[PDB]
Design a protein around this nucleic acid. Sequence first.
RNA 1: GGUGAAAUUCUUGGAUUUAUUGAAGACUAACUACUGCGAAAGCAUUUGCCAAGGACGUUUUCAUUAAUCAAGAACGAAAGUUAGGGGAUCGAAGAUGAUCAGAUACCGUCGUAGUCUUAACCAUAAACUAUGCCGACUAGGGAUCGGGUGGUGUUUUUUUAAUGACCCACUCGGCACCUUACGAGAAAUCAAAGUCUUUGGGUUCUGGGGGGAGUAUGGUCGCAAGGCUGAAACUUAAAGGAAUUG
Lengths: 97, 127, 25, 91, 97, 214, 202
Amino acid sequence: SINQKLALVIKSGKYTLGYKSTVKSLRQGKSKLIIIAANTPVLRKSELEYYAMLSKTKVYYFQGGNNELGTAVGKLFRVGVVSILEAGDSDILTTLA
Amino acid sequence: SQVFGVARIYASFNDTFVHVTDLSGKETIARVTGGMKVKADRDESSPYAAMLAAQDVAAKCKEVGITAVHVKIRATGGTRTKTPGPGGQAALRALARSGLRIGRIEDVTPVPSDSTRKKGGRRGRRL
Amino acid sequence: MRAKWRKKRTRRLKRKRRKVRARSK
Amino acid sequence: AKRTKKVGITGKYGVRYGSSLRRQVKKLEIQQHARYDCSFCGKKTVKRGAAGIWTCSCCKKTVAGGAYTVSTAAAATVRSTIRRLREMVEA
Amino acid sequence: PKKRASNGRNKKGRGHVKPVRCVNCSKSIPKDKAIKRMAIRNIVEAAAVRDLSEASVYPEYALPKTYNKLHYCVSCAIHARIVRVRSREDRKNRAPP
Amino acid sequence: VVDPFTRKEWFDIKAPSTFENRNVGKTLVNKSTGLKSASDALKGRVVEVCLADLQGSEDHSFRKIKLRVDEVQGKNLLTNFHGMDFTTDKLRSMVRKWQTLIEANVTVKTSDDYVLRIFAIAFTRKQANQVKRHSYAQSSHIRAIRKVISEILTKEVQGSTLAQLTSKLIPEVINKEIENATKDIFPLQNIHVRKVKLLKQPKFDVGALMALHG
Amino acid sequence: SGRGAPLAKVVFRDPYKYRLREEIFIANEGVHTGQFIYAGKKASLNVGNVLPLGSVPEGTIVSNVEEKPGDRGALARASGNYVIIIGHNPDENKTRVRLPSGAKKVISSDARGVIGVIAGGGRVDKPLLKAGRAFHKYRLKRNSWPKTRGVAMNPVDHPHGGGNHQHIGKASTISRGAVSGQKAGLIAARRTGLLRGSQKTQ
RNA sequence: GGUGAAAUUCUUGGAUUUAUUGAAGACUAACUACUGCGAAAGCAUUUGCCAAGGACGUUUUCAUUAAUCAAGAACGAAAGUUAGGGGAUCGAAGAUGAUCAGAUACCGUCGUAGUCUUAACCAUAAACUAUGCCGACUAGGGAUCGGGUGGUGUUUUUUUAAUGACCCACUCGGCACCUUACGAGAAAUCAAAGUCUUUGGGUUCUGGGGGGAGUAUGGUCGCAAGGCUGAAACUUAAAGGAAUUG
Ligand SMILES: [Mg+2]
Ligand SMILES: [Mg+2]
Ligand SMILES: [Mg+2]
Ligand SMILES: [Mg+2]
Ligand SMILES: [Mg+2]
Ligand SMILES: [Mg+2]
Ligand SMILES: [Mg+2]
Ligand SMILES: [Mg+2]
Ligand SMILES: [Mg+2]
Ligand SMILES: [Mg+2]
Ligand SMILES: [Mg+2]
Ligand SMILES: [Mg+2]
Ligand SMILES: [Mg+2]
Ligand SMILES: [Mg+2]
Ligand SMILES: [Mg+2]
Ligand SMILES: [Mg+2]
Ligand SMILES: [Mg+2]
Ligand SMILES: [Mg+2]
Ligand SMILES: [Mg+2]
Ligand SMILES: [Mg+2]
Ligand SMILES: [Mg+2]
Ligand SMILES: [Mg+2]
Ligand SMILES: [Mg+2]
Ligand SMILES: [Mg+2]
Ligand SMILES: [Mg+2]
Ligand SMILES: [Mg+2]
Ligand SMILES: [Mg+2]
Ligand SMILES: [Mg+2]
Ligand SMILES: [Mg+2]
Ligand SMILES: [Mg+2]
Ligand SMILES: [Mg+2]
Ligand SMILES: [Zn+2]
Ligand SMILES: [Zn+2]
């Protein structure tokens, strides 16, 4: 699964959780991949996708609501979007995703 | 090598059936075998009676005309003894001897994948 | 009488006795 | 400390109407009062009122549902078979 | 006391076996305890096979038979089929013959 | 006397291109007067012909076949494919005690849109030098075999049309086209293509059925 | 008010005028505010949309079904009710369906229905538990509650009236051909007594 | 039609039969075995997912962390109870047809509940190996399941290996069978039911003539049906076990 490959980025690399911090990342280009929960609204989805295309950042639609994405990133709260800035040693930036 | 049809033999216990029909399925025959020449109500399955009525069966078969036919025999089965009846073989033999040509055969006894629990309960028929 | 029938007879007997004094409950 | 061994919320009815009627009521009572999980935002903030109406506290969405539960058994089973019959008309 | 070490037939270390029902009376009987006899009897008879073949097409092409496994209930098995109540020590012989 | 001897007409049938000889024979159906007449209510049947009955030597005698009548015109009655089956004799003779059975099925389509569920049957072969009368497989084997059977099975079907499909199983080499795969896993006596049964087809397509005659 | 099932206000554009028209539908279970509804023959099969019975395959579930094409909804309108399409006769273009009552009526394929089942289901499973809840229930439907048993009235008030004891006095089953004033009790009852059995038509 | 034989039954409604064919729920035949797995109950079509487990292998790690267990708890066939659904099948009840002196039955017919599933209970079965668990010792034998080791063993031939399946020998842990009896037992029989008047490895439980009676009474569990705990007065010389002869 990919929850595995992602769980290594929290313990190894640098990331940012939250819709607002994720867009400053997409504006400064530091984002290489952004994970979007299943339940997150479509309006925000297309918006994040727009910023991604502008930052030429790739996206991955996480199958599972923000509740699942939060408990997946190891946090105890809903996470609607994640923006990775440094994948310490995770192949997430090189796997099929 | 002359003509084909279907046999459709069926031998129950205390009755038996025999009736030909076109190999296309819906079709027809004359079909009266079981309690036709024998009326005692227990000799229905009896072989002496299976032939007595199977005789009149081949008659109509040849009355309209069918030289050869293959069999499809079937026991009551389904859920009760899955096995041939007394007047099953005692009928086509009296008919193969009646100047009838036969060939590819196979039975069509219905057998399930162990379901539709039988009668009598777990103690069955008690005698 | 059969063993399981003695049980049933006794079960009934207690049910009747049980009822009989619930009248005086 | 535990206040009631069995009545729970149905204690308001006191001793009236019979244990059976009260018991069965508590069942639907519990359902229609509890907070469910919202399918559009992920927070358990969708409560009832006007049975068959389930609205999320935040995200302000309102979903039509069962008189006492958001998803009724029938509707859930229908969702399944509608997905089935729908997947059958594009491929 | 016991009068057979199996106390049934063929069951040690399983607890429960699905039950089959007797062919004769339909009574239920555990498969491991049901006396089994495979009945392979042909469509044949003493003088019925010659009439069958001469006046017919397919000059003895296949000649197939009936195949079906039978399971009896000891009570029914003892009545007609192979029970043949044995002697104290003659019964321990499982030689089919 | 009603005398339904001089009652109605007898119609003829043959078999598609696939086989060597095709004469099916004849049937009896009804008066062709139009109130409720022939054809509109005729071509909805099937017949049970053996394979060696219309192909040749009975090295193909086990296989039974169903032929779906599709369309008719003046005394034409040609019938396309409808399925197949084995025969009680063969299957009941192949299920021997002291060995393990293997059954598997898959639902696919051919190009001649038809989605079909096929069936296969196989058993265990005792090695020449074997000494154990049980001759059994191992679950790992049985699951793996099913996979290769399933995989192989949905290659021919969806790999060609119904015509070539029928022309593909009559030589029966697919039976051992499984064996080359199984030769690396387990002996597997009696590997076959025992049954096939279907559901539907695209609307009639009168023009395509005429490509089985000559 | 006075209805078990919840309503769904759905806004559409007027194809013939720059103006909004707001239809009032019966909310099917699962519908939500801000949802997108599609209406027409060439619509998708999503719970909430409304398509003609012809455009849907067998086994579909629909409510507020039209008895005749274009009557804006006639069948399966109560809380948690629905109809199931059990066949199509493309010639005469009919469509046979099963209604909540179990009866299987056949209607035009151009008749429309809404995918899904009505919301507010299971409302009848909760006991009322007191005349007050029944009182408030009918306070919004009509003046049909409470009901006096005709056997408690004098003969001048009802057929079952009168008697030194409370009894109906004659068969409680009444002929369909009866007259207004005598049709009180079990009207045209084909049977009577406690129903013990299958209770589901084949 | 059904049975030993019949009858209630079903048939201008074309029944039983056939043909194409669809629906519903249930089940997994054959393969199936002195074969496997799980604490027991119990578990047999396919595949995907979810976590889980024993035997083996082991020059890995921890290092006595264990054995058995009143109280307490997990699960627990069948039937049965509550709320839905389901309700094809067979089918307590009931009603019938036949039988009998009688026949509430056995055989036949109809068929409610039930049978199935979800949520919650109930907690008993000859729930059986009528046989506590952990440890050790004592005896011969060929099968077989799983793991493993050993090979100028056979087969696949591809071109021979690699493999895979098979053959042989061994070893650990399985389900069992067989022959012996040193030995045990009241015997039937038992590789434990043996290693006991030459009586002591650890530990849990129960029994003390038969009835009375699993009754009465209290307590407690359950919606109930019931479960668990559980006497006595009195009565009685046998009841019982395995084996032998009739
Ligand atoms: Mg007897
Ligand atoms: Mg006495
Ligand atoms: Mg009182
Ligand atoms: Mg005895
Ligand atoms: Mg047993
Ligand atoms: Mg048991
Ligand atoms: Mg009033
Ligand atoms: Mg009233
Ligand atoms: Mg009143
Ligand atoms: Mg009065
Ligand atoms: Mg009056
Ligand atoms: Mg009057
Ligand atoms: Mg009166
Ligand atoms: Mg009264
Ligand atoms: Mg199977
Ligand atoms: Mg205590
Ligand atoms: Mg039922
Ligand atoms: Mg009765
Ligand atoms: Mg008698
Ligand atoms: Mg009587
Ligand atoms: Mg009675
Ligand atoms: Mg019956
Ligand atoms: Mg006990
Ligand atoms: Mg036992
Ligand atoms: Mg033992
Ligand atoms: Mg004892
Ligand atoms: Mg030994
Ligand atoms: Mg080796
Ligand atoms: Mg060993
Ligand atoms: Mg001795
Ligand atoms: Mg001795
Ligand atoms: Zn919300
Ligand atoms: Zn029997």
